[PDB]
Design an enzyme around this catalytic site. Sequence first.
Site, PDB file in Angstrom:
ATOM      1  N   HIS A  41       0.763  -1.181  -0.032  1.00  0.00           N
ATOM      2  CA  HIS A  41      -0.233   0.102  -0.051  1.00  0.00           C
ATOM      3  C   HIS A  41       0.958   1.124  -0.166  1.00  0.00           C
ATOM      4  CE1 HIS A  41      -0.553   1.260   4.622  1.00  0.00           C
ATOM      5  NE2 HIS A  41       0.740   0.909   4.454  1.00  0.00           N
ATOM      6  N   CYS A  95       3.740   5.572   5.472  1.00  0.00           N
ATOM      7  CA  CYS A  95       3.697   4.374   6.242  1.00  0.00           C
ATOM      8  C   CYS A  95       5.117   3.889   6.321  1.00  0.00           C
ATOM      9  CB  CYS A  95       2.881   3.352   5.680  1.00  0.00           C
ATOM     10  SG  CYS A  95       3.224   1.743   6.567  1.00  0.00           S
ATOM     11  N   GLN A 113      -7.929  -3.085   9.766  1.00  0.00           N
ATOM     12  CA  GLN A 113      -9.128  -2.366  10.154  1.00  0.00           C
ATOM     13  C   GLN A 113     -10.371  -2.756   8.829  1.00  0.00           C
ATOM     14  OE1 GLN A 113      -8.713   1.813  10.740  1.00  0.00           O
ATOM     15  NE2 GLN A 113      -9.719   1.200  12.894  1.00  0.00           N
ATOM     16  N   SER A 136      -5.779   5.324  10.067  1.00  0.00           N
ATOM     17  CA  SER A 136      -4.417   5.713   9.674  1.00  0.00           C
ATOM     18  C   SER A 136      -4.283   6.811   8.722  1.00  0.00           C
ATOM     19  CB  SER A 136      -3.630   4.692   9.273  1.00  0.00           C
ATOM     20  OG  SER A 136      -3.546   3.546  10.226  1.00  0.00           O
ATOM     21  N   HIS A 139      -5.444   5.355   1.660  1.00  0.00           N
ATOM     22  CA  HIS A 139      -4.773   4.222   1.014  1.00  0.00           C
ATOM     23  C   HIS A 139      -4.854   3.930  -0.423  1.00  0.00           C
ATOM     24  CE1 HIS A 139      -3.997   2.455   5.288  1.00  0.00           C
ATOM     25  NE2 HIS A 139      -5.003   3.176   5.526  1.00  0.00           N
TER      26      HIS A 139
END
EC number: 5.2.1.8
Length: 145
Positions: A41, A95, A113, A136, A139
Amino acid sequence: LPPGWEKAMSRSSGRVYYFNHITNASQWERPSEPARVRCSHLLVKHSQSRRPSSWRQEKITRTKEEALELINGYIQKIKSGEEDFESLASQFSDCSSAKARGDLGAFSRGQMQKPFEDASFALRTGEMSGPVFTDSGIHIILRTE
């Protein structure tokens, strides 16, 4: 059509397209359960991310709207061939703990998630999501195995 896919017609252009309500992918081209999938990702964080800091920016201040614009721009560059996914993940993903070119390794249901999990399992191998939202950030997901 495979799970999540629907057919539509563009109002502005009249061209048929396909969109997936689980992965948020949309494409002009016509599309075509394991215990685990493997995905890479690219994450774009924003000021409302649970941890608004990353290896590439000490203090992340962009809005969620601005993060979404960046994500959509990266999708456009991948689809056009201007950049490859792996380069953009290496250069721009917020990330820090994935591999640089995006790999998260393999995972099962129950670990990530739900929006990210559902998108990941609804991609076939080699398919890329649209913008997927979690705590977060936003994505782009690429399923590899």
